Structures are given as C-alpha cells and as structure tokens.
Amino acid sequence: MRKLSDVYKVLALTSLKSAGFITDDKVNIEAWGKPEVLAHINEGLTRLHSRFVLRTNNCIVEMKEGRTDYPLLARYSYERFDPAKAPYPYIMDTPQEPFQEDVIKILNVYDSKGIRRKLNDDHDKNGLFTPRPDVLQCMWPRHFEALNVLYQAKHPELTGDENQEIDLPETLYSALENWVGYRYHTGLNTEGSTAKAAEYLQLYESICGEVVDFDLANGSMSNTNVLFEKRGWV
Amino acid sequence: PDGKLPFVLVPYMPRKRELYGEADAELLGDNQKILGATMRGMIDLLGRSAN
C-alpha cells in the first residue's frame, strides 16, 4: 500500500519523464503541475476501480420514518453530517472508517433481519429500487430496520496530502502510470505528444487485459449451485 | 428322534465344498457401481444446466 508521495516519484521516472515540471533532482514533480497530476491519478484510480471489482465495501443505512429515497452520499452520514444539506443522518460509520462517498455500483443489500431484498424488481414488494446509481428507494420503511448495502467502490478521493496511502494491487501500477501518461500527453495538442498519448493509452488496455487474463484482480467467480436442490431434483 | 441338529441350511448359489452359499449380489458387484455412476452423471448433466 504505497503513498501518494511515492507515486509522484515513480511517475516522475517512468511515465512523466520528459515532462517539463520534473524537478532538477529528477525524483519529484514541481509544485505547479501537482494539481494536474493529482487530478489524473484520481481519474486513473476511478477507471481502474470501475472495470475490475477491486474494492467491495458495505455501509449500513438505518431507516428514518417518512423517508423512502435514501441517497448514499456523505452529507447524510453520521461522522460527516452536514446540517445545511441534510435534515437527519441515517448512514452509520465509525470515526476510523467514515463514509467516503465512493459508491460506483450497488450489488447486494441485506436487512436487519437477514432477509435479502431484490434490486430493480418491478413485481416484487420487498424490493429496493435504485432510481439513480447512488440512491436507494425502499418503499416500506419498517420499524427497527437497516440495510447492509454491498457495493462496488472507488478509491477514496485523493485530496492532495503526500501522506495518503493508495489502495492498488502491485501488478496494476504499470497501468495507472500508462493512464497518467495518456491524460498528460494528450492535452499538449502537439503531434509528437499526441502520438505518444495513444501508445500510453493502448498500453493501459494491454496491461488491463493481462490482469484479467490471469485473474490478478479477482474477476473469476465460482459459487455452489444452491438452485439445484430448491427446484426439486432429488 | 432324528438325533441331529435342528437346523436346515440351503444355499442360493452353492459354493464348491462349502457349507454356506454365495448370494446373488456377489457377481452383480461393480455393475451397480458403474450403472449408478452413469445415471448420476446424466442427472448431473441435466440438473447442473440452465433451462
């Protein structure tokens, strides 16, 4: 689990090596292009955390009476309650692991009783529809309820602090660099730099293909066929 | 009156020069095994599919 400070250095030696903002020691990035690079790493992790299922996290959502639509934002959480934009907090997070507003796709939600509730099932009372990816529409907020919502997650936003640690598999760092190089080299609008951006972007797919061709990101899934015994079939 | 043990023993399939007899499932061994292992394979093929 590397640090953003180390990512700056490793970026300065492999991908952004001919970049202008490389400092005189060649092992760091000048303080004028760091917002630019940080805005490329954040997008880079978001893409990598979108294709592969890299971070599966669950955040429980308490039921408040009278509210059916339950946006899974950070303003409604407990530790990050924002009284100006949220009437009451209903998500539950601990101080050490607060909600980071990092929901990409919601996968499976259980209950406080252990009953699994289907997702997007038109003919299914006891079903939680999601009218938009980062929301949740429970049509019957029963008493004493909660919802462990297993969802695909993205890396928590990199504010810019050089001591924030990055959660990426070590084998996928050769693809994050090839995406930062793409974003940087494609903005210069020069013929030489643009042709390099395509090479860096295509290499991103090649490495993202070798990671999925060897199950290095846990993409293959096998499960016990519990359906067999239920449908009869002695 | 007969002055003998009051037991009468008859074999199903006699064993040569042996008091006890050999039953039917002795030769039928491994035939049930193969037939069951094939029927279970067919049922596995049908049930572990998507209909």
Coordinates of C-alpha atoms in Angstrom, one line a residue:
Chain A
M1 CA 0.0 0.0 0.0
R2 CA 2.1 2.8 -1.4
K3 CA 1.8 6.5 -0.6
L4 CA 1.0 9.5 -2.9
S5 CA 4.5 10.8 -2.3
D6 CA 5.9 7.6 -3.7
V7 CA 3.5 7.7 -6.6
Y8 CA 4.8 11.1 -7.5
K9 CA 8.4 9.8 -7.6
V10 CA 7.6 6.6 -9.6
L11 CA 5.5 8.7 -12.0
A12 CA 8.5 11.1 -12.5
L13 CA 10.8 8.3 -13.6
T14 CA 8.7 6.1 -15.9
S15 CA 5.7 7.9 -17.4
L16 CA 6.2 11.7 -16.9
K17 CA 9.9 11.5 -17.6
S18 CA 10.1 14.1 -20.4
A19 CA 7.5 16.3 -18.7
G20 CA 8.5 19.9 -18.1
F21 CA 7.6 20.1 -14.4
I22 CA 10.1 17.4 -13.5
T23 CA 12.4 18.9 -10.8
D24 CA 16.2 19.1 -11.1
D25 CA 16.7 16.0 -9.0
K26 CA 14.5 14.0 -11.4
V27 CA 12.9 12.2 -8.5
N28 CA 9.9 14.6 -7.9
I29 CA 7.3 16.8 -9.6
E30 CA 7.3 20.6 -9.3
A31 CA 4.7 22.3 -7.2
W32 CA 3.0 23.8 -10.2
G33 CA 1.9 20.6 -12.0
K34 CA 1.0 18.6 -8.9
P35 CA -2.7 19.6 -9.1
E36 CA -2.7 18.4 -12.7
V37 CA -1.1 15.0 -11.8
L38 CA -3.3 14.6 -8.8
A39 CA -6.3 15.2 -11.0
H40 CA -5.0 12.4 -13.3
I41 CA -4.3 9.8 -10.6
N42 CA -7.8 10.4 -9.1
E43 CA -9.4 9.7 -12.5
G44 CA -6.9 6.8 -13.1
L45 CA -8.0 5.0 -9.9
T46 CA -11.7 5.6 -10.7
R47 CA -11.4 3.9 -14.1
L48 CA -9.4 1.0 -12.6
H49 CA -11.8 0.6 -9.7
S50 CA -14.7 0.6 -12.2
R51 CA -13.7 -2.2 -14.6
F52 CA -12.3 -4.6 -12.0
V53 CA -14.1 -5.3 -8.7
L54 CA -11.2 -4.1 -6.6
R55 CA -12.9 -2.7 -3.5
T56 CA -16.1 -4.2 -2.3
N57 CA -17.5 -2.3 0.7
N58 CA -20.8 -2.3 2.7
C59 CA -22.3 0.7 4.5
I60 CA -25.4 0.1 6.6
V61 CA -28.3 2.5 6.1
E62 CA -30.7 3.0 9.0
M63 CA -34.4 3.6 8.3
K64 CA -35.9 7.0 9.2
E65 CA -39.7 7.1 9.1
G66 CA -41.2 9.2 6.4
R67 CA -38.1 8.9 4.1
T68 CA -38.2 6.4 1.2
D69 CA -35.5 7.8 -1.1
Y70 CA -32.1 7.2 0.6
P71 CA -29.2 8.8 -1.3
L72 CA -25.9 7.2 -0.3
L73 CA -24.0 10.5 -0.1
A74 CA -21.5 11.6 2.6
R75 CA -23.7 14.5 3.7
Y76 CA -26.3 12.1 5.2
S77 CA -23.7 10.0 7.2
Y78 CA -23.1 10.2 10.9
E79 CA -19.5 11.3 11.3
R80 CA -19.8 13.7 8.3
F81 CA -23.2 15.1 9.0
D82 CA -23.9 18.4 7.1
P83 CA -26.8 20.1 8.8
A84 CA -27.1 22.6 5.9
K85 CA -27.9 20.0 3.3
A86 CA -29.2 17.0 5.3
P87 CA -32.2 17.1 7.8
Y88 CA -31.1 14.0 9.7
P89 CA -28.2 11.5 9.5
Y90 CA -29.2 7.9 8.6
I91 CA -26.0 6.1 7.3
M92 CA -23.8 4.6 10.0
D93 CA -20.0 4.9 10.0
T94 CA -17.3 4.7 12.7
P95 CA -14.8 7.5 13.2
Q96 CA -11.9 5.4 12.0
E97 CA -13.7 4.5 8.8
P98 CA -16.1 7.3 7.8
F99 CA -18.2 7.2 4.6
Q100 CA -16.1 8.4 1.7
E101 CA -18.9 8.9 -0.9
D102 CA -17.4 6.1 -3.0
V103 CA -20.3 4.2 -4.5
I104 CA -20.0 3.2 -8.1
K105 CA -22.5 0.3 -8.3
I106 CA -24.7 -1.2 -5.7
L107 CA -24.6 -5.0 -5.8
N108 CA -26.5 -6.7 -2.9
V109 CA -28.4 -5.4 0.1
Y110 CA -29.4 -7.4 3.1
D111 CA -31.6 -6.3 6.0
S112 CA -31.6 -6.1 9.8
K113 CA -33.4 -9.5 10.0
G114 CA -31.2 -11.3 7.4
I115 CA -33.8 -11.2 4.5
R116 CA -32.2 -10.4 1.2
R117 CA -34.2 -7.8 -0.8
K118 CA -34.1 -7.9 -4.6
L119 CA -32.8 -4.9 -6.6
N120 CA -34.8 -3.3 -9.5
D121 CA -37.6 -5.9 -9.5
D122 CA -40.8 -4.3 -10.8
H123 CA -43.1 -7.1 -9.5
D124 CA -41.5 -7.6 -6.0
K125 CA -42.8 -5.9 -2.9
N126 CA -39.8 -6.1 -0.5
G127 CA -37.6 -4.7 -3.3
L128 CA -35.3 -1.7 -3.1
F129 CA -35.3 0.2 -6.4
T130 CA -32.4 2.5 -7.2
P131 CA -33.7 5.5 -9.2
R132 CA -30.1 6.7 -9.7
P133 CA -26.8 4.8 -9.1
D134 CA -26.0 6.5 -5.8
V135 CA -29.6 6.3 -4.3
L136 CA -32.0 3.8 -2.9
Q137 CA -35.8 3.7 -2.8
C138 CA -37.2 1.5 -0.1
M139 CA -41.0 1.5 -0.4
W140 CA -41.7 0.4 3.1
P141 CA -39.5 1.8 5.9
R142 CA -40.4 -0.7 8.6
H143 CA -39.6 -0.1 12.2
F144 CA -36.2 -1.1 13.6
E145 CA -34.6 -1.7 10.2
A146 CA -31.2 -1.2 8.5
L147 CA -29.6 -2.2 5.2
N148 CA -26.1 -3.6 4.7
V149 CA -25.5 -2.5 1.1
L150 CA -22.7 -4.4 -0.6
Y151 CA -21.5 -2.1 -3.4
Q152 CA -18.6 -1.7 -5.8
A153 CA -16.4 1.1 -4.5
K154 CA -13.8 3.5 -5.8
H155 CA -10.6 4.6 -4.1
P156 CA -11.3 7.4 -1.6
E157 CA -10.6 10.8 -3.1
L158 CA -7.0 11.9 -3.0
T159 CA -7.1 15.4 -1.5
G160 CA -3.5 16.2 -2.2
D161 CA -1.8 15.3 1.0
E162 CA 1.5 13.5 0.3
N163 CA 0.9 11.0 3.2
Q164 CA -2.3 9.5 1.9
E165 CA -1.9 5.8 1.2
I166 CA -3.1 4.3 -2.1
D167 CA -5.0 1.0 -2.3
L168 CA -4.0 -0.5 -5.6
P169 CA -2.7 -4.0 -6.4
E170 CA 1.0 -4.0 -7.1
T171 CA 0.5 -5.6 -10.5
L172 CA -1.8 -2.8 -11.7
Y173 CA 0.7 0.1 -11.1
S174 CA 2.1 -0.3 -14.6
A175 CA -1.4 0.5 -15.8
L176 CA -2.0 3.6 -13.6
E177 CA 1.2 5.1 -15.0
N178 CA 0.2 4.4 -18.6
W179 CA -3.1 6.3 -18.0
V180 CA -1.5 9.3 -16.3
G181 CA 0.8 9.4 -19.3
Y182 CA -2.2 9.3 -21.7
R183 CA -4.0 12.1 -19.9
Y184 CA -0.9 14.3 -19.7
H185 CA 0.5 13.8 -23.2
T186 CA -2.9 14.2 -24.9
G187 CA -3.5 17.7 -23.7
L188 CA -0.4 19.3 -25.2
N189 CA -2.1 19.2 -28.6
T190 CA 1.3 18.7 -30.3
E191 CA 1.7 16.0 -33.0
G192 CA 4.6 14.4 -31.2
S193 CA 2.9 14.3 -27.8
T194 CA -0.5 13.2 -29.2
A195 CA 1.1 10.1 -30.9
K196 CA 2.7 9.2 -27.6
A197 CA -0.6 9.5 -25.8
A198 CA -2.2 6.8 -28.0
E199 CA 0.7 4.4 -27.2
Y200 CA 0.3 5.0 -23.5
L201 CA -3.4 4.6 -23.6
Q202 CA -3.3 1.4 -25.7
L203 CA -0.7 0.0 -23.2
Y204 CA -3.2 0.7 -20.5
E205 CA -5.6 -1.7 -22.2
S206 CA -2.9 -4.3 -22.7
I207 CA -1.9 -4.3 -19.1
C208 CA -5.6 -4.2 -18.0
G209 CA -6.0 -7.2 -20.3
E210 CA -3.1 -9.2 -18.9
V211 CA -4.6 -8.6 -15.4
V212 CA -7.9 -10.1 -16.4
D213 CA -6.3 -12.9 -18.4
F214 CA -4.6 -14.2 -15.3
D215 CA -7.2 -13.4 -12.6
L216 CA -4.9 -11.0 -10.7
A217 CA -7.8 -8.7 -9.8
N218 CA -10.2 -11.5 -8.6
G219 CA -12.6 -11.4 -11.5
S220 CA -13.4 -15.0 -12.0
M221 CA -16.2 -16.3 -9.7
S222 CA -17.5 -19.7 -8.8
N223 CA -20.4 -20.5 -6.5
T224 CA -22.2 -23.5 -5.1
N225 CA -25.3 -24.4 -7.2
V226 CA -27.8 -23.9 -4.4
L227 CA -30.6 -23.5 -7.1
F228 CA -30.3 -27.3 -7.8
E229 CA -31.8 -28.6 -4.5
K230 CA -34.5 -25.9 -4.4
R231 CA -36.1 -26.7 -7.8
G232 CA -36.7 -30.3 -6.8
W233 CA -34.1 -32.6 -8.4
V234 CA -33.6 -35.2 -5.6
Chain B
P1 CA -35.9 -88.6 17.2
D2 CA -33.5 -87.8 14.3
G3 CA -30.6 -87.2 16.6
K4 CA -29.3 -84.3 14.6
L5 CA -29.0 -80.5 14.9
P6 CA -32.5 -78.9 14.5
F7 CA -31.3 -76.6 11.7
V8 CA -31.8 -76.8 7.9
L9 CA -29.5 -74.7 5.8
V10 CA -29.9 -74.3 2.0
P11 CA -27.6 -72.2 -0.2
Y12 CA -28.8 -69.9 -3.0
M13 CA -25.8 -70.4 -5.3
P14 CA -23.7 -73.2 -3.8
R15 CA -20.0 -72.8 -3.0
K16 CA -17.9 -75.8 -4.0
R17 CA -17.3 -78.0 -1.0
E18 CA -18.5 -75.3 1.4
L19 CA -21.4 -75.3 3.9
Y20 CA -22.5 -71.7 3.3
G21 CA -23.7 -70.4 0.0
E22 CA -23.0 -67.3 -2.1
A23 CA -25.8 -64.8 -2.7
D24 CA -26.7 -63.0 -5.9
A25 CA -25.0 -59.6 -5.4
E26 CA -21.6 -61.2 -5.5
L27 CA -21.4 -61.3 -9.3
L28 CA -23.5 -58.2 -9.6
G29 CA -20.7 -56.2 -7.9
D30 CA -19.4 -53.1 -9.7
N31 CA -22.2 -53.4 -12.2
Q32 CA -24.4 -51.4 -9.9
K33 CA -21.5 -49.0 -9.3
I34 CA -20.9 -48.3 -13.0
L35 CA -24.7 -48.0 -13.7
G36 CA -25.2 -45.7 -10.8
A37 CA -22.2 -43.6 -11.7
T38 CA -23.5 -43.2 -15.2
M39 CA -27.1 -42.4 -14.1
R40 CA -25.8 -39.8 -11.7
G41 CA -23.7 -38.3 -14.5
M42 CA -26.7 -38.0 -16.7
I43 CA -28.7 -36.4 -13.9
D44 CA -25.8 -34.1 -13.2
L45 CA -25.7 -33.1 -16.8
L46 CA -29.4 -32.3 -16.8
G47 CA -29.7 -30.6 -13.4
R48 CA -26.5 -28.5 -13.4
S49 CA -27.7 -26.8 -16.6
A50 CA -29.8 -23.7 -17.4
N51 CA -33.3 -24.4 -18.5

